[PDB]
Amino acid sequence: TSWRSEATFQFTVERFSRLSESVLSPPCFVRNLPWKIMVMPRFQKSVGFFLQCNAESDSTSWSCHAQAVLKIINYRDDEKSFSRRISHLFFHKENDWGFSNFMAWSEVTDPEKGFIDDDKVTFEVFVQADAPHGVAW
């Protein structure tokens, strides 16, 4: 159910080499909160990869601590997938967390590295969140 304490979800960004603005994935519910993958180019240069939580809510009383593994899937060999871990207390003023320079843009778009295919790159997040506060009273 949506109350699950953890989950793994993916989002495939199409026309990746042409990405010019931030893109958001549909939500994956964990602890009954919407979590989304946010990807954005940073300075071509680097791939920005962030995990967002409950950004749509107008509430300013919620908080949720979570740990996650952000990974860019290598379609040729999963062992070559690149990942970084995060731990963060999400709340209205800090509702997303990740890396502005997760990977070099040149590396992810290199047709010989195995991260891109048909100009598509897949991002994956494994999130483990604690019970949130200020949500379900």
Binding site: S22, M38, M40, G48, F50, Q52, R84, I86, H88, E94, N95, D96, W97, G98, F99, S100
Partner: peptide
């Protein structure tokens, strides 16, 4: 790590 940081916010976007």
């Amino acid at each position: 790590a940081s916010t976007s």
